[PDB]
Write a protein that binds this ligand. Sequence first.
Ligand SMILES: Nc1ncnc2c1ncn2[C@@H]1O[C@H](COP(=O)(O)OS(=O)(=O)O)[C@@H](O)[C@H]1O
Ligand SMILES: Nc1ncnc2c1ncn2[C@@H]1O[C@H](COP(=O)(O)OS(=O)(=O)O)[C@@H](O)[C@H]1O
Lengths: 176, 174
Amino acid sequence: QQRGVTIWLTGLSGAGKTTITHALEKKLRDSGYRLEVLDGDVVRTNLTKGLGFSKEDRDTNIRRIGFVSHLLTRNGVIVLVSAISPYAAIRQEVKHTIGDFLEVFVNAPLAVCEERDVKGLYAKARSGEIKGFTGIDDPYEPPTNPDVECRTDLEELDESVGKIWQKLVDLKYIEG
Amino acid sequence: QRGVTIWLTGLSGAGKTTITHALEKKLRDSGYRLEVLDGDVVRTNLTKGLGFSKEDRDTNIRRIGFVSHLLTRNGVIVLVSAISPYAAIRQEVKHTIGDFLEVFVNAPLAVCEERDVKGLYAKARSGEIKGFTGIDDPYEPPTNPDVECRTDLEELDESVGKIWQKLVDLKYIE
Ligand SMILES: Nc1ncnc2c1ncn2[C@@H]1O[C@H](COP(=O)(O)OS(=O)(=O)O)[C@@H](O)[C@H]1O
Ligand SMILES: Nc1ncnc2c1ncn2[C@@H]1O[C@H](COP(=O)(O)OS(=O)(=O)O)[C@@H](O)[C@H]1O
């Protein structure tokens, strides 16, 4: 049994949002659930191609992802969003529009993300090669009341996915 | 019942929006699950910021196709109303979506220009607006649409009826 819902992963670059998204996607698909993934890194090559990382463009980006997530959710689809989405007021705006919405705070310390520097972006932010990088010289406003929080430096992947899954069960979006 | 994109293409003023709304009502009143993506409306949200250059119309149509695809493959009936003047781009979206009906809303340029519903034809003729479809920008008519509605020669009910019957024939609806 399946009801529409947007599962919204927010957090720093490198915090592990994509990894959780993919593991959660697999778990859901293997149970027969109907889903769509909207990953910021990927949709910025199509749906939101042309946008940069100014405040205006991040707002446009998140609002556009929210638009598509809303249409899918209200038609019964489970939508997995993975996007830095650093502005709380914008996340709240999307949550309010969609209603069936779960905010997942993928919470890793800045220092941990910077040490791994998976795509080399932190070093480029520090040197000034890149301007306005989230967490270094651009805001990240952490969720104050997320529905699920995953402290990825302190919990195993299965534990993080498990908490999202259990929340979906508790709220009866998927079968227990 | 089955997902499908119903894609209305045609000149400004040809009657696309009127057919869309009438079709939407008929589908909803029969219990069907749908979404409408009207070019005039999505250009205030989904495609806000784009103009009417070739590259912007391509971006516009491709982005509408992106959303239509995700909805269609999840069982939703999607009604698109957009000038979509480039045949190759309509074909590209049709190919991506698969379950796609191209509806040619075909009114003569002269009929659309004489009504000039939004005053845009007069603005195109004076040069107030540049690159207006059918006046100084292309419209490439479908050569093999799934349904054609000659709105200057058909009653609204007849145009809607043909789209409905096509949906029935192809088993998208009961
Ligand atoms: N200035 C930047 N700030 C954050 N991420 C950036 C920046 N420049 C490039 N990126 C890349 O863009 C990705 C973030 O895109 P989004 O999740 O779509 O951002 S968001 O702020 O608009 O939500 C990061 O994973 C990173 O790879
Ligand atoms: N240069 C223009 N050409 C066509 N339509 C225009 C133009 N400028 C403003 N408009 C308005 O924009 C609408 C067309 O938008 P679309 O259907 O989204 O066009 S499309 O070519 O990109 O598919 C028309 O109904 C008309 O009202």
